[PDB]
Amino acid sequence: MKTYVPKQVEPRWVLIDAEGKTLGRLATKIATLLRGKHRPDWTPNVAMGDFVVVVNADKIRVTGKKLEQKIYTRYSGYPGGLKKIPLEKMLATHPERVLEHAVKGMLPKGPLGRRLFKRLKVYAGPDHPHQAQRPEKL
Amino acid sequence: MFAIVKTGGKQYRVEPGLKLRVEKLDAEPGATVELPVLLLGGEKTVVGTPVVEGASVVAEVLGHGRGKKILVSKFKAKVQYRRKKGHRQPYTELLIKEIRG
Amino acid sequence: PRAKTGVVRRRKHKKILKLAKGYWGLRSKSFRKARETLFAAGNYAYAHRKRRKRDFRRLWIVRINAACRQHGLNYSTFIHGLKKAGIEVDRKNLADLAVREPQVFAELVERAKAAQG
Amino acid sequence: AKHPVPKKKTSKARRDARRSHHALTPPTLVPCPECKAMKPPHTVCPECGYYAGRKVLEV
Amino acid sequence: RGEVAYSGRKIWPQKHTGRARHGDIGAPIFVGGGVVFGPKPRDYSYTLPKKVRKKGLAMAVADRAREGKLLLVEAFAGVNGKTKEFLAWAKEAGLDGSESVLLVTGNELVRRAARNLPWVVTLAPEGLNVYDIVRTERLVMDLDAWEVFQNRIG
Amino acid sequence: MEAKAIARYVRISPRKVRLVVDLIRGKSLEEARNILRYTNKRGAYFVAKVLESAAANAVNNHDMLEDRLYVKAAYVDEGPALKRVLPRARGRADIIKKRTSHITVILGEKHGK
RNA sequence: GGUGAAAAGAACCCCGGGAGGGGAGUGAAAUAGAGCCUGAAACCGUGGGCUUACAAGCAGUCACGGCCCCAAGGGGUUGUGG
RNA sequence: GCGUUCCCGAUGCCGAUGAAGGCCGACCCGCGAGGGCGGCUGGAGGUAAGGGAAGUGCGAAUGCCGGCAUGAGUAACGAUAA
Ligand SMILES: [Mg+2]
Ligand SMILES: [Mg+2]
Ligand SMILES: [Mg+2]
Ligand SMILES: [Mg+2]
Ligand SMILES: [Mg+2]
Ligand SMILES: [Mg+2]
Ligand SMILES: [Mg+2]
Ligand SMILES: [Mg+2]
Ligand SMILES: [Mg+2]
Ligand SMILES: [Mg+2]
Ligand SMILES: [Mg+2]
Ligand SMILES: [Mg+2]
Ligand SMILES: [Mg+2]
Ligand SMILES: [Mg+2]
Ligand SMILES: [Mg+2]
Ligand SMILES: [Mg+2]
Ligand SMILES: [Mg+2]
Ligand SMILES: [Mg+2]
Ligand SMILES: [Mg+2]
Ligand SMILES: [Mg+2]
Ligand SMILES: [Mg+2]
Ligand SMILES: [Mg+2]
Ligand SMILES: [Mg+2]
Ligand SMILES: [Mg+2]
Ligand SMILES: [Mg+2]
Ligand SMILES: [Mg+2]
Ligand SMILES: [Mg+2]
Ligand SMILES: [Mg+2]
Ligand SMILES: [Mg+2]
Ligand SMILES: [Mg+2]
Ligand SMILES: [Mg+2]
Ligand SMILES: [Mg+2]
Ligand SMILES: [Mg+2]
Ligand SMILES: [Mg+2]
Ligand SMILES: [Mg+2]
Ligand SMILES: [Mg+2]
Ligand SMILES: [Mg+2]
Ligand SMILES: [Mg+2]
Ligand SMILES: [Mg+2]
Ligand SMILES: [Mg+2]
Ligand SMILES: [Mg+2]
Ligand SMILES: [Mg+2]
Ligand SMILES: [Mg+2]
Ligand SMILES: [Mg+2]
Ligand SMILES: [Mg+2]
Ligand SMILES: [Mg+2]
Ligand SMILES: [Mg+2]
Ligand SMILES: [Mg+2]
Ligand SMILES: [Mg+2]
């Protein structure tokens, strides 16, 4: 008989930004990071993983054209309208989300993935006025 | 010291003195000694070398104060008008006492 | 001779009830709401003991992989590096080395890529 | 016995759950002058009474 | 069902009451109702093959004798039906009352003698039967008796 | 220590009095008195009386001394209900249940340091 | 339909208009006190333990982790995850 | 194969040093139906081996009888002559 359990770790954050990347192609890696999928002391039920921080938001490439080609229905008020929003908008009118959303649909659906999304901390920087230990990853 | 022996199609890593279930063995009596194969020395100041099935002769010395144990269970298959609660599996356990490496 | 139901039943039920103690509502207060439950509970356990097995199969791979990925290699490559090398060992499970005594693992990795020189 | 009707016995849960707001509220009484007894605020209780106003009987 | 003492009226209109459909309160699913397959007074006898009825008494006497518990008596000092006298007899007769004794004799006086001993089954000779034989641990009978039993098959 | 009361077969629905009762669960005998004294319900007059007697007992019978006692605990149980027929429209007729209650109250001594 | 072997069926005091109770007392027994043996289940309560107010469910099952009564184990509960 | 009632075994054997039934238990024994053990309750019956007999096993028949729930502290409280 065996067992393989980890005690109370210590959230080892990460500061990051590759605005030269394609969100998604990036987001994944971020998500992968979020939940401790890289750190070999796994426990899908625990909630241990990097406290990922992304700076210098946007500036993100995005392959082919999403000049209103990428729509964000996401919003369905309730009476008769399902308000749609193209990329351009979010970029101009407060971006960040752009990447945020990309991360949500990569993190699991439970109160955990919900909790994990609480880790991610993206800003439209550069500048992450919120850290005491940014371990910028490459 | 470390070590990884295989028994009952299953392989465990043992130390210098301990054990649990392992599965019925013709080691008929309780106070008896048996030696199961080994798979990775243990890295300690004594070694740390594995290899192809590590059949390097060396093995683990195991005694064992056992007696075919069992355990609750209850296996109730059930379809539909088909019920078969007709199952109690306790599974025979075989307690061992790992000695030396 | 008239054989009354007498006791029989009551007992026949107390049994099933005990079995279903701690359940939700009538689910654990009804000689039958209980039954119906204990049924699901039936396969559930059974079907799961089958899952649990292959549950850890996966539960480990992650470790292995998310462990030997630190030494620049795929769990995919890794494994193969062993099969074609020789190692009816490690037992996706016993790759618990990747955690406890990671140096034991190290040699393995290097051992791995070896077979693929 | 007619048109709209309960579609399910209400669970002992949601039953009590519905009563959460049933708890009674203690009345509000106060010292009261003369007698060290109790009376509710802004009230003339039949014992000592009031001043300039009648009540029961005293001396 | 019909054996019961209720009316035959049809308790309910049968079609627009929601209530289950029903006959008379005599219906066996009505508590008060009549039993379905209850027991009816019936006989249980049958005619066991004579040639067997006897070959059976044979194995009876037999067994008991093979175990040496068979005893053909003759000397009976017991008179005017007296428990004492009988008990006395058996004593020196080799029957202290340890094993059950099937006593069979054409002597009603002896009959009375043990007619009351808890460890004895007194039975006229013509009444011999595998049950009682088997029922008791020791068979003891008058010579006369053993003859008739023999006459019953030589 | 503790003084009991219990007044069975009162004739008022349990649910109904349980209310006045929870209103005094664990309190100074001195206070509860006032409370019930001005609690507008019918249970009052019932739980009143009882609680008042638990007091009596407490003293007269268990020498506990009024001043130091309160409401250790109290509660109410269903009694055997009286079924009654209620003529319903179109000759339906229903059975109304005049429920009944068992009010128990147990005093106790507060402290002594 | 069934108090108890026997009415010995609850004097007297206390609360209360009564009913009911609390002591006292009878009895082997009063959770044998009177539609009173035994008294199951549904159902209504009081007290205690674990547990819940960002989360979506045939109500369970598998797995780890935490809290509460005995200790290379077990029970009870259940926070996530499957 | 397991249980229920009954008869033979019984002028027997258990039984107030507590039967039957009930309420608990993480014990033991059976693949299972069940069978034992132990602890509280109960207070007078029970019934081995091995056999024989049946009114012999319930979750559903808008089943039947009884009890208790839900709706619900909701509608109502029976002429608006006060
Ligand atoms: Mg926007
Ligand atoms: Mg076994
Ligand atoms: Mg079955
Ligand atoms: Mg039946
Ligand atoms: Mg299913
Ligand atoms: Mg595998
Ligand atoms: Mg409740
Ligand atoms: Mg007729
Ligand atoms: Mg008639
Ligand atoms: Mg007709
Ligand atoms: Mg209908
Ligand atoms: Mg009748
Ligand atoms: Mg009849
Ligand atoms: Mg003839
Ligand atoms: Mg006789
Ligand atoms: Mg005879
Ligand atoms: Mg007073
Ligand atoms: Mg009306
Ligand atoms: Mg009319
Ligand atoms: Mg009596
Ligand atoms: Mg009694
Ligand atoms: Mg009673
Ligand atoms: Mg009696
Ligand atoms: Mg009870
Ligand atoms: Mg509580
Ligand atoms: Mg939450
Ligand atoms: Mg929200
Ligand atoms: Mg919360
Ligand atoms: Mg929830
Ligand atoms: Mg569901
Ligand atoms: Mg669980
Ligand atoms: Mg779950
Ligand atoms: Mg009978
Ligand atoms: Mg006789
Ligand atoms: Mg005896
Ligand atoms: Mg019986
Ligand atoms: Mg108990
Ligand atoms: Mg017992
Ligand atoms: Mg008993
Ligand atoms: Mg038998
Ligand atoms: Mg039989
Ligand atoms: Mg029948
Ligand atoms: Mg049925
Ligand atoms: Mg209907
Ligand atoms: Mg009914
Ligand atoms: Mg109703
Ligand atoms: Mg309503
Ligand atoms: Mg309303
Ligand atoms: Mg109204």
**Partners of residue F104 on adjacent β-strands:** F75
Q: What span, in angstroms and rounded, lies between the C-alpha atoms of F112 and E15?
A: 75
4-43 on A, CB < 7 Å from strand G: 5, 43
Please check whether residue A17 is in contact with residue A126, taking contact to mean a CB–CB distance below 8 angstroms. yes
A25-34 vs A97-104: helix crossing angle, rounded to 10 = 60
Question: CA angle, C39 as apex, C37 and C42 as ends, to 5°?
Answer: 120
121-150 on E, CB < 7 Å from strand H: 135
Owner of token pair 């007899």: E89
Tokens of E66: 């093979």
Please check whether residue B61 is in contact with residue B35, taking contact to mean a CB–CB distance below 8 angstroms. yes
**ω into E125 cis (within 30 of 0):** no
Q: What span, in angstroms and rounded, lies between the C-alpha atoms of F64 and F6?
A: 18
Nearest partner of A37 among C80, C104, C59, judged by Cα? C59
Question: CA angle, A26 as apex, A20 and A31 as ends, to 5°?
Answer: 150
Tokens of A90: 């979010």
Residues in chain C with CB shorter than 8 Å from the CB of D10 are: none
Residue B2 dihedral angles phi and psi, to the nearest 5°: -115, -175
CB of C5 under 7 A from strand H?
yes
Owner of token pair 């249940």: F97
Please check whether residue E61 is in contact with residue E133, taking contact to mean a CB–CB distance below 8 angstroms. yes
The method of structure determination was X-ray
CATH class of F2-110: alpha beta
* Distances from the Cα of C115 to the Cα of B93, C54, C61, C82, angstroms: 39, 28, 21, 7
Q: What span, in angstroms and rounded, lies between the C-alpha atoms of E145 and E128?
A: 9
3-state secondary structure F77-101: EECCCEEEEECCCCCCCEEEEECCE
Nearest partner of E114 among E92, E95, E87, E134, judged by Cα? E87
| Cα C27 → chain centroid | 27
* Distances from the Cα of D3 to the Cα of D53, E18, E89, F89, angstroms: 59, 17, 96, 16
Please check whether residue B8 is in contact with residue B92, taking contact to mean a CB–CB distance below 8 angstroms. no
The letter for the amino acid at D9 is K
Q: What span, in angstroms and rounded, lies between the C-alpha atoms of E111 and E80?
A: 10
Q: What span, in angstroms and rounded, lies between the C-alpha atoms of C104 and C107?
A: 6
Q: To the nearest whole angstrom, how far is the Cα of C26 from the nearest Cα of chain D?
A: 9
Ligand 44 centroid–CA F90 distance in Å is: 20
3-state secondary structure B15-42: CCCCCCCCCCCCCCCCCCCECCCCCCCC
Question: CA angle, E126 as apex, E121 and E129 as ends, to 5°?
Answer: 60
**Other CB atoms within 10 A of residue E13 CB:** 9
21-60 on C, CB < 7 Å from strand H: 21, 31-33, 35-36
- B/e letters for F35-58, b = 16+ CB within 10 Å, e = fewer, are bbebbebebbebbbbbbebbbebb
Domain regions of chain F by residue span: 2-110
Q: What share of chain C is helix, strand, coil (3-state, %, to 5)?
A: 65, 0, 35
Please check whether residue F51 is in contact with residue F43, taking contact to mean a CB–CB distance below 8 angstroms. no
Q: What span, in angstroms and rounded, lies between the C-alpha atoms of E146 and E141?
A: 6
- Specify the pairing of strand B62-63 against strand B97-98: antiparallel
Nearest partner of B76 among C38, F17, F27, judged by Cα? C38
Neighbours of chain A (3+ CB pairs under 8 A): B, C
Q: What is the CA radius of gyration of chain C?
A: 26
Please check whether residue E56 is in contact with residue E49, taking contact to mean a CB–CB distance below 8 angstroms. no
Q: What span, in angstroms and rounded, lies between the C-alpha atoms of B41 and E74?
A: 96
Q: What is the CA radius of gyration of chain B?
A: 18
Residue E22 dihedral angles phi and psi, to the nearest 5°: -150, 155
Dihedral sign (CA A81, A82, A87, A93): positive
Q: What span, in angstroms and rounded, lies between the C-alpha atoms of F106 and F58?
A: 9
Nearest partner of A127 among A41, A17, A46, judged by Cα? A17
Q: Is A103 exposed, middle or buried (0-12, 13-18, 19+ CB in 10 A)?
A: buried
Q: What span, in angstroms and rounded, lies between the C-alpha atoms of E137 and D2?
A: 80
Owner of token pair 């428990």: E83
3-state secondary structure of E140: strand
Resolution, angstroms, 1 dp: 2.8
Residues in chain A with CB shorter than 8 Å from the CB of C62 are: 37, 42
Nearest partner of E120 among E141, E145, E143, E106, judged by Cα? E141
**What's the DSSP call for residue E127?**
G
Nearest partner of F69 among F106, F39, F103, judged by Cα? F106
For residue E25, which ligand has an atom nearest its CA? 8
Q: What is the CA radius of gyration of chain A?
A: 17
Collect all residues with Cβ–Cβ distance below 8 Å to F28 and sequence separation of at least 6.
F70, F71, F110
Total length of chain D: 59
